[PDB]
Amino acid sequence: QFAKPEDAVKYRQSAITLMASHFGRMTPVVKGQAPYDAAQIKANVEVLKTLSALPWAAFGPGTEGGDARPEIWSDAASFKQKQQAFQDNIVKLSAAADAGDLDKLRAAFGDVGASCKACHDAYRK
Amino acid sequence: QFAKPEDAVKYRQSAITLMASHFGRMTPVVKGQAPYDAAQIKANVEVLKTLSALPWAAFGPGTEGGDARPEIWSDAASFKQKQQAFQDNIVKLSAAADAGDLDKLRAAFGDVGASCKACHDAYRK
Ligand code: HEC
Ligand code: HEC
């Protein structure tokens, strides 16, 4: 859907910005600094699950740029494993949020965060 | 969820970028230049319906900036009517996509586009 590689870069940066906001805005809740409203979190995590699927389609062939390392394309199977693992932890976070259980939310949140970092360590400049 | 007004600006710009991409990428399909795959479009419009709800919460009080005109805040009821009308046309586009009917999709797409422009005419610098 991108006329030029730069358009894919801008899309994925925007997608990731949104994803990151819907993840990070739960930090005070996980930490207990903000109240836990199970319905609120369930709805937010539903947004996050939609958003978490979007960046990866904007690293298509020929869309090198931004802070994406070239290894994303030359190691496509490994990059896909990092995106898959992240999306699988997002499924776990959805399950926690759907259950309405703060202890499970906290644990699932930390797993997601670790998956963000794991991908960055290998694939973000 | 924004530490500073600029963070709300960046969020809404990213949200709108995503929304705009999921809308605009259907232009070739509407025009008949790309094939019409009803399932493909139904799924894309589901993404668009999630995205289309997100920008407006990032124009909260005190988040003036970017290319948002100040009238968004001093005319809050009118701005809400433009966002509502847009989201109501998004519901119509979802119905069209769910029905699998290209003629209805085309018509609903044009209504959505007109609502984008209508808001810009009043509220985008
Ligand atoms: C690989 C499978 C990743 C996962 C999982 C996550 N991120 Fe990431 N992120 C990745 C890349 C390759 C890039 C650079 C994109 C580019 O082309 O520039 C990023 C970037 C970010 C950014 C900055 C976005 C911007 O506006 O430029 C942030 C804030 C960020 N990533 C956060 C983030 C979070 C919180 C994640 C898990 C919830 C996450 N990312 C996962 C690759 C990957
Ligand atoms: C008001 C209810 C709007 C509707 C409906 C749509 N847009 Fe808009 N848009 C609006 C504002 C106030 C702004 C400026 C935001 C800011 O703070 O800068 C915008 C901006 C855009 C942009 C540029 C985004 C960026 O990256 O800075 C685009 C490409 C854009 N808008 C497109 C767009 C489309 C295609 C819409 C309907 C599908 C649409 N917008 C609706 C306000 C409103």
Numbering used by the authors:
A (entry chain A), B (entry chain A): 901 to 1025
Quoted passage from the original study:
Cytochromes c′ occur in methanotrophic, denitrifying and photosynthetic bacteria and have proposed roles in protection against nitrosative stress, NO trafficking during denitrification or pathogen defence. All cytochromes c′ have a 4 α-helix bundle structure containing a heme centre with a solvent exposed proximal His ligand and a buried hydrophobic distal pocket with a non-coordinated residue (Leu or Phe, rarely Met or Tyr) in a position to exert steric influence on the binding of diatomic gases. Unusually, cytochromes c′ are able to utilize both heme faces (distal and proximal) as a means of discriminating NO from other diatomic gases. In order to understand the factors controlling distal versus proximal NO coordination, we have examined NO binding to AXCP variants in which the occluding distal residue Leu16 is replaced with residues that are smaller (Ala, Val), of comparable size (Ile) or larger (Phe).
All of the tertiary structures are similar to wt AXCP and only salient points concerning the heme region are discussed here. Ferrous structures show the different residues at position 16 to lie over the heme in a similar manner to that of Leu16 in wt AXCP with the exception of L16A where the side chain is essentially truncated.
